[PDB]
Write a protein that binds this ligand. Sequence first.
Ligand SMILES: Cc1cc2nc3c(=O)[nH]c(=O)nc-3n(C[C@H](O)[C@H](O)[C@H](O)COP(=O)(O)OP(=O)(O)OC[C@H]3O[C@@H](n4cnc5c(N)ncnc54)[C@H](O)[C@@H]3O)c2cc1C
Ligand SMILES: Cc1cc2nc3c(=O)[nH]c(=O)nc-3n(C[C@H](O)[C@H](O)[C@H](O)COP(=O)(O)OP(=O)(O)OC[C@H]3O[C@@H](n4cnc5c(N)ncnc54)[C@H](O)[C@@H]3O)c2cc1C
Lengths: 509, 509
Amino acid sequence: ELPPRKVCIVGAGVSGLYIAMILDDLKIPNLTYDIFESSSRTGGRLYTHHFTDAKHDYYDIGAMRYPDIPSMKRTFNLFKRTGMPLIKYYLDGENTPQLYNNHFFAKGVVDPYMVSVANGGTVPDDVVDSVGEKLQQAFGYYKEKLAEDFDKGFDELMLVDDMTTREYLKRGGPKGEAPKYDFFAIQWMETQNTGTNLFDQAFSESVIDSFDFDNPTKPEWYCIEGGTSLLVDAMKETLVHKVQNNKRVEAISIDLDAPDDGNMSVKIGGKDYSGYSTVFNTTALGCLDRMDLRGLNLHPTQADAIRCLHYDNSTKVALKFSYPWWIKDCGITCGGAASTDLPLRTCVYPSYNLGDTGEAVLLASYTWSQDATRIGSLVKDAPPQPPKEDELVELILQNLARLHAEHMTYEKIKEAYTGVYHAYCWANDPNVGGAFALFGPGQFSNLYPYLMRPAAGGKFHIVGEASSVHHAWIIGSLESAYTAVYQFLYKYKMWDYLRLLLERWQYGL
Amino acid sequence: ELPPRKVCIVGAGVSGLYIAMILDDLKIPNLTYDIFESSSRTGGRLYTHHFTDAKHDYYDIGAMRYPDIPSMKRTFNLFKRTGMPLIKYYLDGENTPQLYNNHFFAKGVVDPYMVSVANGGTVPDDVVDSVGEKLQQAFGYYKEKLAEDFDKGFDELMLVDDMTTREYLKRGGPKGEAPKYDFFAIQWMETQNTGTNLFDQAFSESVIDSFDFDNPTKPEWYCIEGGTSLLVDAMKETLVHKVQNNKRVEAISIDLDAPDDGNMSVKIGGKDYSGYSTVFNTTALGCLDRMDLRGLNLHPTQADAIRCLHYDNSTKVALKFSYPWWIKDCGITCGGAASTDLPLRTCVYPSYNLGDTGEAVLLASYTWSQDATRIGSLVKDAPPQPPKEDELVELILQNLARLHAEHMTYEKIKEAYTGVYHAYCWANDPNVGGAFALFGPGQFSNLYPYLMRPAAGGKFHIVGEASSVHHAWIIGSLESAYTAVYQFLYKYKMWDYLRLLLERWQYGL
Ligand SMILES: Cc1cc2nc3c(=O)[nH]c(=O)nc-3n(C[C@H](O)[C@H](O)[C@H](O)COP(=O)(O)OP(=O)(O)OC[C@H]3O[C@@H](n4cnc5c(N)ncnc54)[C@H](O)[C@@H]3O)c2cc1C
Ligand SMILES: Cc1cc2nc3c(=O)[nH]c(=O)nc-3n(C[C@H](O)[C@H](O)[C@H](O)COP(=O)(O)OP(=O)(O)OC[C@H]3O[C@@H](n4cnc5c(N)ncnc54)[C@H](O)[C@@H]3O)c2cc1C
């Protein structure tokens, strides 16, 4: 029979909970685990903010929307296994405004935003109306390969991973045989396609982003009615060993001079927790880098990956209104999102309140990168009280009025605002230190393989979305967790249970 | 005689104060100004934190150190004009530790850090010990041109501005005739030379950074004894019209239908302030982007520059100790700085406390870019109180013990720590939204010229360090301010006073 063994799961986000879910399902004799979570809260970047207990009065600060595409099958299987109430999420709605250079988009008009050279701007005339087509030409080949087989497509994409998106567009691809674009053409493509400055990160990441958001299969999207935190609730409920919150791991070690399976330990608040046969670290890499890892003897390049792999920032701001004025007054009855060059950048109309006539939540601002850092500078842990003006609220109200100026006035939007809002900047969260991995040029092809290198003789695993090829998605966390469990069972040669893992979990259970 | 005119200065940092200082010196008949500052505090990124009123018990959160090089002459002239108490600043000290891959640097040893291929790492053997030489070969030609004439050198540098530092090193320069470096070679150069990920920004910015920090003239450095805020005090004192604090400009406009000189206005807290013949905006670009600028009719590309020009992040953490253990125990008696791959990254030993035997301040962490964002995630407006652990303090104490392990133990460093510290993350400051401009590839050569474009018929100026070719220095703010004043006098044809400006201010007064 199997000897008694214990493993340590660092962090209680979806990766850590999924590891525990797999172990609980396999029911390996005499195997137990501790799950330590630094926060008082469980679920990590799955985080629903409830303004009240009212059915729809919430927004998702973390994960919100799921495209139903083959590479995401494991995520949807988790949704099914846990009985999640899925409803349609509308990525594109009806009547959503798009506002750039203070002009609204109009179909069938040349340069509606008046940013082209012909109109006194610097965007090349042959670019301004063509961003979709030109980026399709840039990304399209690789998206098609990714759609056939994600892993094979990814390996082929790695052959160009040395370039930033800007570099690829500037030079016409790796041999110069694709179209070459000037600075202002690329700037406009970035402005239309993504967050400020993000074309200065990996071309491969832009490709994958486009694969996920504009997938060749033209997928249905879903969200969880009641918020994504319902998944965390469901996952917690089934745990054989409950999450231990307020436990922040500060060091991880292995004693190589000890013959035992159980020769690993972690330190929490100066105290040693020992006897572990494997440690799965599930935290964002910023949190991992702060730990004292000397006791693991990590490869220097693996250590570099932990410090240097790039993370994007993201900020969300949600406001409550006495009625859904966007639905009633503006005819935006189907969800979707408005985009603009104004500071808010993106206004997302909830897909879960469409029938409500009373109080309603609007995700008024959703930003990334430098845009998110700038909104984030206004987001305080203790928002300013009414004896003072809230600069962030006034900014959002003013931007919303401009974006909605076709049907709304600032006065009306402000009058409908209830005075209740919430905002969150992920780079300001001490338990994450960023929104999610978005790698720089060369990182996937050079550093990532060392991040994923076996460590501590095969007993230490760096697990999570960053530790996968699908960054910024639940799927990345789940695939990473599944793969680490595979490696743990293999290491200890538990062949019955590895066979069972494959039988039950290969597509997810 | 000159008609009555009024101008508006937005923001009370060094740029805005300098504009007012110039106007006050010229004494133009019937000319007045308002200076509006959003903060309750004056001086912006000149900010000294005093722990107590004790002579040396402070650190500079903003500007701290000044190299005495020709391109900085205007800064030193300001120091002289205001009677600043300058003392030597030691960029390099004695006995400062350097720690990477958990090894201390040793002179005359091959790969002391054990990161080269020969030692089981990935840094090429021909790179690891040669970073200085290889970066000198990369930057050297341009540094020499900048040293001859900064403006001419800058114009020549613009011819390669399309490249990131990484790209320049990867491709062997613009025609491929310089050495070409692989990913891990570039990674190590970045690790040794700058903040995490910064080689993914403009090659030109890396050049200028190297020009400023390792200048061919091998300059003396200075700091202001008593802190940089003494300069703000001195500048405020002389103002003919005092700073109006707690006034946050939310919009700027010109009425083109009005024949008057005085046809510009700003909005503060919903209220109009009008009658201005020119407006000098001195704020960081993030703050400018949040204003409603429609009333200025800015060129679309000028608007893009405001949104898109890249800013770096920077974080500082200063701790007080009961005695200067670095001086007494470690022999670091001369200032300087320690560098490491640990989260703190840089530990700066003050140049102003060298003779003190009592309580003393250490700037324990000084970081940029992603390193600064990560430390910054632990920096709270209301730091956690002792009923709770302060994660940031424990991190700094642990890193300091590792960096100082040659002479110190964690226990001793912790015992000497008084429990008093202060930290600041500039990207979290709502009145800045970043530390300072650090442009991405192509930005200086493409967007910057539109940022600097005449606006509102020559009556609106975007002024500040970002609005110059020396980012991240007081000199950039002063040159920008001087140039905007020149343009204002020219616009209104005040030839006597323009001639006087040149006579008195061309090198600074
Ligand atoms: C703004 C935003 C929007 C997103 N939108 C979507 C979406 O629409 N769809 C989608 O599929 N995905 C989305 N995601 C991604 C998804 O939320 C994440 O990929 C996933 O939740 C990450 O889970 P994880 O377990 O890998 O990491 P985490 O959620 O970060 O879990 C790690 C846990 O470790 C804990 N921890 C940190 N340090 C320590 C320590 N020292 N000791 C112990 N514990 C520690 C943390 O508190 C945390 O709970 C979004 C992410 C963000 C940031
Ligand atoms: C971490 C750090 C270290 C540095 N170290 C050095 C150094 O060693 N040596 C050196 O020479 N330089 C250094 N600098 C640079 C120097 O501090 C800055 O370049 C300079 O102080 C910027 O001055 P400014 O007037 O251009 O901008 P700011 O200092 O940002 O002044 C702008 C002012 O506008 C105000 N404002 C913002 N929005 C509004 C609004 N809407 N309405 C009204 N007012 C508004 C702000 O509150 C601020 O006071 C450092 C900078 C940083 C961030």
